[PDB]
Ligand binder design. Sequence first.
Ligand code: IVP
Ligand code: MG
Ligand code: ZN
Length: 313
Amino acid sequence: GLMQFTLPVRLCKEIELFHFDIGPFENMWPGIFVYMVHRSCGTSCFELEKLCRFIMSVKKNYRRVPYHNWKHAVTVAHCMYAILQNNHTLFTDLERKGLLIACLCHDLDHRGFSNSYLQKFDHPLAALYSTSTMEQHHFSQTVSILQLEGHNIFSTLSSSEYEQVLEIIRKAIIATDLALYFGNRKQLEEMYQTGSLNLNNQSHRDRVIGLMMTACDLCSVTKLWPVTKLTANDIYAEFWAEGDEMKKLGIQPIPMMDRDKKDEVPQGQLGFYNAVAIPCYTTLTQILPPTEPLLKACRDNLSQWEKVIRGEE
Ligand SMILES: COc1ccc(CN(Cc2nc3ccccc3c(=O)[nH]2)C(=O)Nc2ccc(C)cc2)cc1
Ligand SMILES: [Mg+2]
Ligand SMILES: [Zn+2]
């Protein structure tokens, strides 16, 4: 109860900034998450005995893939922490609790393959879940781990609060399906412009939380150039392995996943920043003004990719 987590000075200061990198020491990532839960939520939010056992079961159910791994889980939860801390009064006690856990769990048991590859392969999960295939799997795995003896970090919520938090986590994890992001952001764009956006409207909050999830999930592009550049290698390592597996099924992959088209990566990154990242953090900045540093960092990295193309690196 009187047992805080403390970080070294540099981490204690940098963890509050959006562009924080959690570092290469895996054994510090659980403590960093607990630290973020305590400052975001309270030292009372969760029984430390149960939280620590939940964290270690979640860690175990992430795989050793190049990008969709335990480091990504903690990276995405830190972005959510930074968003929640810079928007103190806009979120209920349940939402702060739910969303850090949703972020930690959002890619549970990822295999390093897209929903598309599962459908072309004809993977059992694609029969069980026809849309948002992996994302419905991630929420399933989350629920399973919550029901292991000693892992129910929500036990002390009331029956109705318990149902509200699981519902927040389900919508939050489904929203990480990038296919659903485009429509969600177009709707939020119209609602903000015509002036009908209303955060006391539950359907509206849902939409806003979904965009927050997309923004935390894409946060690779809001780091300092050397983190962004080195993370892009891990992402392409998964994508090119999936492209290889497509070729094995006798399907030419999209160039994004074809390791023979590495030359086209800089131009492919421009398309991604312009079609996905910039719009995401722009709409997010419009709704939650204090998330502007994410948009600023994203534009900086766009500019760095433009320099790669112009031969300057
Ligand atoms: C931040 O890290 C990242 C690393 C990789 C990626 C992969 N990526 C960029 C990309 N890279 C290529 C590479 C080679 C050849 C061709 C391409 C190509 O056409 N796309 C996308 O997601 N593109 C995209 C997706 C959706 C829309 C709507 C528009 C564009 C994205 C982000
Ligand atoms: Mg995912
Ligand atoms: Zn993710």
